[PDB]
Design a protein around this ligand. Structure first.
Ligand SMILES: COc1cc(C(=O)N2CCC(N3CCN(C)CC3)CC2)ccc1Nc1ncc2c(n1)N(C1CCCC1)c1ccccc1C(=O)N2C
Length: 335
């Protein structure tokens, strides 16, 4: 079967795969309400993964927000603690993600784009007030349904306030320059870079900076934003120091026929300097999102999120203990 849940849920279809692991749509037995169930097959075998899972449970259990994917249940172990391998999390089931929507024959008007961006930023304002950087925002991590309701998901990369830049890789289309040309101060401005990229992706329905490798990535950014001012720098320095004085291409020539306000907002997000970028809070006060802006319906998260548990260097078994403790804690609060 490979999905041995109880009689509380009824599996419908298998939707697909995270890197680890499996997501099936289901139906709660008593309410008939549709949920999504993620099985994590060997959740405690690999220290790095177990750490991700623990991290992601804590952040989701901390957040209550219409624009951030949510945990509805975590299933108890149905076997002894020693034998417990696979963890099942019940989450909000959405109908698609934003990647499928952008890259489809269906039409995508500015009204869609405007509404999708508003929800994204409303979600991030809450996160960032909790002092949680998402770090991996992309359209496939933005879940969506028929009535354009949007939810941010996948917090496995999230961080408070090692990794290596491998060359031949095309997986950094939404990564902020500070994570590339490694500056020593990483803040929540990181997500607003990715938002800019995502935003722009919707306006053209095609990737803004689709780099094929590490270098092609920095080239593509430079081709639009120009060279970063000397001050905005400091081995890696050399590659850029000697490259003809590049000027920023205006966003109007990048997107011909686009909306004046949309670009004003976009231009406040895609900027090398992390401090130069708008915050999510401020972005919501932009004319572009004026239709939707409601001060009394765009809350912060309090208290903020402690990352103590993450810093601590834990064994494989001690992370299993902590994850199990999150499951027991989850049920204690509800029941
Ligand atoms: C029917 O629901 C969806 C379809 C799709 C979708 O259109 N595709 C395109 C075709 C994809 N192929 C890869 C898998 N193969 C079986 C062929 C289909 C599946 C994803 C995307 C998101 C969907 N909805 C969805 N709802 C909830 C999700 C989630 N996705 N997912 C997806 C669950 C499938 C893989 C990820 C999430 C994605 C990012 C972050 C969080 C989640 C998440 O935790 N949940 C619970």
């Amino acid at each position: 079967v490979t999905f041995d849940v109880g009689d509380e849920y009824e599996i419908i279809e298998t939707i697909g795969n995270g890197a680890y692991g499996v997501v099936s749509s289901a139906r709660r037995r008593l309410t008939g309400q549709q949920v999504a169930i993620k099985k994590i097959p060997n959740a405690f075998d690999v220290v790095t993964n177990a750490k991700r899972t623990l991290r992601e449970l804590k952040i989701l259990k901390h957040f209550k927000h219409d624009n951030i994917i949510a945990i509805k249940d975590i299933l108890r172990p149905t076997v002894p603690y020693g034998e417990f391998k696979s963890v099942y999390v019940v989450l909000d089931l959405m109908e698609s993600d934003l990647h499928q929507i952008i890259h489809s024959s269906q039409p995508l008007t500015l009204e869609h784009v405007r509404y999708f961006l508003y929800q994204l930023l409303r979600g991030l304002k809450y996160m960032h007030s909790a002092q949680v950087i998402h770090r991996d925002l992309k359209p496939s991590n933005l879940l969506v349904n028929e009535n354009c309701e949007l939810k941010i998901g996948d917090f496995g990369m999230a961080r408070g306030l090692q990794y290596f830049m491998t060359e031949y890789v095309a997986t950094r289309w939404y990564r902020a320059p500070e994570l590339m040309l490694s500056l020593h101060e990483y803040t929540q401005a990181i997500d607003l870079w990715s938002v800019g990229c995502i935003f722009g992706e919707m306006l053209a329905r095609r990737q803004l900076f689709p780099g094929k490798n590490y270098v092609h990535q920095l080239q593509l950014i430079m081709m639009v934003l120009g060279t970063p001012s000397p001050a905005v720098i400091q081995r890696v320095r050399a590659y850029i120091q000697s490259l003809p004085p590049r000027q920023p291409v205006p966003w109007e020539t990048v997107y011909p026929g686009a909306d004046r306000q949309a670009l004003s907002l976009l231009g406040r997000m895609l900027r090398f300097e992390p401090s130069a970028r708008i915050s999510a809070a401020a972005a919501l006060r932009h004319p572009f999102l004026a239709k939707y802006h409601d001060p009394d319906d765009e809350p912060d998260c309090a208290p903020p999120f402690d990352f103590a548990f993450d810093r601590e260097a834990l064994t494989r078994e001690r992370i299993k203990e902590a994850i199990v403790a999150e499951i027991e804690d989850f049920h204690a609060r509800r029941e």
